[PDB]
mmCIF file of C-alpha atoms in Angstrom:
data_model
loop_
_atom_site.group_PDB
_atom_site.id
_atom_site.type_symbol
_atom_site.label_atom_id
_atom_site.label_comp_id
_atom_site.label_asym_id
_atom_site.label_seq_id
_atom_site.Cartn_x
_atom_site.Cartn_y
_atom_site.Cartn_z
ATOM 1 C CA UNK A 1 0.000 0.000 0.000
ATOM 2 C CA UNK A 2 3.403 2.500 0.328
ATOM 3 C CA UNK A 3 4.991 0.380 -2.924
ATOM 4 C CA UNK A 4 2.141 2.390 -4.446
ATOM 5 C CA UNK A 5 3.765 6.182 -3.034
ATOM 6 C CA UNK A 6 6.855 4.468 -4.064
ATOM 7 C CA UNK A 7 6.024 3.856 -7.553
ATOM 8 C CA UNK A 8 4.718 7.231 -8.512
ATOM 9 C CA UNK A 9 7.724 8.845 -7.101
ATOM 10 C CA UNK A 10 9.384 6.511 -9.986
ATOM 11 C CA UNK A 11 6.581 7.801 -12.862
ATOM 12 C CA UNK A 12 7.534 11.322 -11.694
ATOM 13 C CA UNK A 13 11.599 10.860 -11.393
ATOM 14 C CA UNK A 14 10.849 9.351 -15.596
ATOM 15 C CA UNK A 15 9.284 12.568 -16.409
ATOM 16 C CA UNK A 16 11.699 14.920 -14.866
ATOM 17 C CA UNK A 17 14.553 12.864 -16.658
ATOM 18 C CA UNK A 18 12.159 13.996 -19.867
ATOM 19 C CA UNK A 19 11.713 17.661 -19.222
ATOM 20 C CA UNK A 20 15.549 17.556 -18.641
ATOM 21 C CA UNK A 21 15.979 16.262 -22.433
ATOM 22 C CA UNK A 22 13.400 19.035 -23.420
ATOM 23 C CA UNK A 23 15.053 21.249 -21.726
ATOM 24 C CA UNK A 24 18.535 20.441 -22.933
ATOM 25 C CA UNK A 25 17.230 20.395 -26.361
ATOM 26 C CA UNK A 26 15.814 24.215 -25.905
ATOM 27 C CA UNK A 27 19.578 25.094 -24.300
ATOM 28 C CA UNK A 28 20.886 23.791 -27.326
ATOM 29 C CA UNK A 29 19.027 25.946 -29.465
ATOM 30 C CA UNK A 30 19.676 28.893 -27.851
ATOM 31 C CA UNK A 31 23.246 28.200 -27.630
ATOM 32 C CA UNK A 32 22.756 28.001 -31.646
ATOM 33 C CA UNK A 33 21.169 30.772 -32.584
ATOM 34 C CA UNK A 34 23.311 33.016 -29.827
ATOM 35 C CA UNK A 35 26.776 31.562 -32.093
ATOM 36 C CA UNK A 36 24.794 32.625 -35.734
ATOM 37 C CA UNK A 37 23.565 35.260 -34.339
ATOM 38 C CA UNK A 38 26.479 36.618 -32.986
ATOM 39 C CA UNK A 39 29.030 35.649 -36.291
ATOM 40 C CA UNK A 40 26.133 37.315 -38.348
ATOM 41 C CA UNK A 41 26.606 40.758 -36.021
ATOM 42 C CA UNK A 42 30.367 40.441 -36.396
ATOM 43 C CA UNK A 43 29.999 40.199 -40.579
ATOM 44 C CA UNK A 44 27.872 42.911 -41.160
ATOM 45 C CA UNK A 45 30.060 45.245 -39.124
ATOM 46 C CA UNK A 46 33.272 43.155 -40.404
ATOM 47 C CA UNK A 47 34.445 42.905 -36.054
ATOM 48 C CA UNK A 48 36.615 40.339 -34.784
ATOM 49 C CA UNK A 49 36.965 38.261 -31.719
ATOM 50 C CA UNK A 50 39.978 41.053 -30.747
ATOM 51 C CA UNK A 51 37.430 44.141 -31.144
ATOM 52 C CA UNK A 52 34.926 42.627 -29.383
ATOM 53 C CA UNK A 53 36.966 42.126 -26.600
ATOM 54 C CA UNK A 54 39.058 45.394 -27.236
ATOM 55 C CA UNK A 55 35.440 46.973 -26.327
ATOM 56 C CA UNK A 56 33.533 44.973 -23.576
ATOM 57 C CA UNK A 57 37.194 44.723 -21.844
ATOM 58 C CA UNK A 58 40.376 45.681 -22.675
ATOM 59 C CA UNK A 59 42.544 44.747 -20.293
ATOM 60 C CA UNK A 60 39.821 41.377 -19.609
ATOM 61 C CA UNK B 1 39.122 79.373 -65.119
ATOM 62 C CA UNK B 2 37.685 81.830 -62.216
ATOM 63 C CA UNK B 3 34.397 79.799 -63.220
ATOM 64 C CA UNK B 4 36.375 76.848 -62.379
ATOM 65 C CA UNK B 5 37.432 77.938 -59.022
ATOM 66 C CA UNK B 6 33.539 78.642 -58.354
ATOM 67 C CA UNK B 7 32.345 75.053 -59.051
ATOM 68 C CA UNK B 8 35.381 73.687 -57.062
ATOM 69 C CA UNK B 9 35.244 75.688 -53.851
ATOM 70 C CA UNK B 10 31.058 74.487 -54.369
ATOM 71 C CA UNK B 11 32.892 70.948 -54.385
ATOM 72 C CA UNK B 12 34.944 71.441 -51.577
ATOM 73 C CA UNK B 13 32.488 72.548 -49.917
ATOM 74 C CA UNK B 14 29.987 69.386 -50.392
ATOM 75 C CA UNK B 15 33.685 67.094 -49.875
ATOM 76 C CA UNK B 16 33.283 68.909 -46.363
ATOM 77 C CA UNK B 17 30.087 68.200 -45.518
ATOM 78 C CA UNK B 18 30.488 64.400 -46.484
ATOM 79 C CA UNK B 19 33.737 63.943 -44.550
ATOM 80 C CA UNK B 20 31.661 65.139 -41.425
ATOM 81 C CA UNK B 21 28.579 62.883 -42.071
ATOM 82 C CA UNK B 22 30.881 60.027 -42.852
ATOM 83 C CA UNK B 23 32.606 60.655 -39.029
ATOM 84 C CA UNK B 24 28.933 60.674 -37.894
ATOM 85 C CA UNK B 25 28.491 57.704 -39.464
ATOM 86 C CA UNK B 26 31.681 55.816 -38.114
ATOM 87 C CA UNK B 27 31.005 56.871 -34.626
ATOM 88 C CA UNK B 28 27.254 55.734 -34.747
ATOM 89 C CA UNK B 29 28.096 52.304 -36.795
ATOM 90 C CA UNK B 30 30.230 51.189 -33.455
ATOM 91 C CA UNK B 31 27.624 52.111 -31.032
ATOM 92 C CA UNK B 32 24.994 50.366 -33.150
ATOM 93 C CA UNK B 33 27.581 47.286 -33.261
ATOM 94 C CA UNK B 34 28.296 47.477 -29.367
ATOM 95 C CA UNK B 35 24.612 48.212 -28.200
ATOM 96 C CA UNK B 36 23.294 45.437 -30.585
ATOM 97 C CA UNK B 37 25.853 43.102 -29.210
ATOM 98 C CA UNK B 38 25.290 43.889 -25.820
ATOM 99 C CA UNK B 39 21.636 43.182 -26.321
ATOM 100 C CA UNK B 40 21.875 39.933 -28.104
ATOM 101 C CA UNK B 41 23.966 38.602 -24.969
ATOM 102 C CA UNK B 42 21.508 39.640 -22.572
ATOM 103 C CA UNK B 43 18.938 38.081 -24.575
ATOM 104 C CA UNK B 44 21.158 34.985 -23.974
ATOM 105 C CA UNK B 45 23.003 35.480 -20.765
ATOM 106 C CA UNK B 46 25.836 35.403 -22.470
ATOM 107 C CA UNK B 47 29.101 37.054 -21.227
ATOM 108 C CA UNK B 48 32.641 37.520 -23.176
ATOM 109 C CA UNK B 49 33.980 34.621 -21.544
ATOM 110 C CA UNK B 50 31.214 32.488 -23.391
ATOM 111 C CA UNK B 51 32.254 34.631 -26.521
ATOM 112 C CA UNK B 52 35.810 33.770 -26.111
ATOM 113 C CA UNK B 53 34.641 30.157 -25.950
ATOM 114 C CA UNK B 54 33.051 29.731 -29.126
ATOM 115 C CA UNK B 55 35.031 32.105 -31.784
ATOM 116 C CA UNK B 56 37.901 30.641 -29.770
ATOM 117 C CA UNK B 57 37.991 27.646 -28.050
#
């Protein structure tokens, strides 16, 4: 009758190991589009690694 | 010739004017570039550190 608590605590530990992969997949993404998005900025205004650091942070 | 020195003080004039928009334009360019930066890695909590990361790893 408490093999029944402990059995839903093992449906719900399944789906929080499958928001995790959801979640990693959105991370992922975002991660992606940051990188494109980013070498896309640096093209159009033809900036390098060294300016972008030369202007957040000199000295780092 | 005197008509000469008319039209190019007129083109001086206009090469003037250009060579101050054009510094206008060079100074707004890199805060465009810097502010649009700036927002795309708060959009992604990114910091230089992660930049350095992934143009150099």
């Amino acid at each position: 009758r408490l093999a029944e608590f402990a059995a839903a605590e093992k449906a719900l530990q399944e789906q929080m190991a499958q928001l995790e992969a959801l979640k990693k997949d959105a991370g992922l993404k975002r991660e992606i589009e940051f990188e494109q998005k980013l070498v896309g900025l640096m093209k159009s205004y033809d900036k390098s690694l060294r300016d972008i650091i030369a202007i957040l942070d000199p000295k780092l």
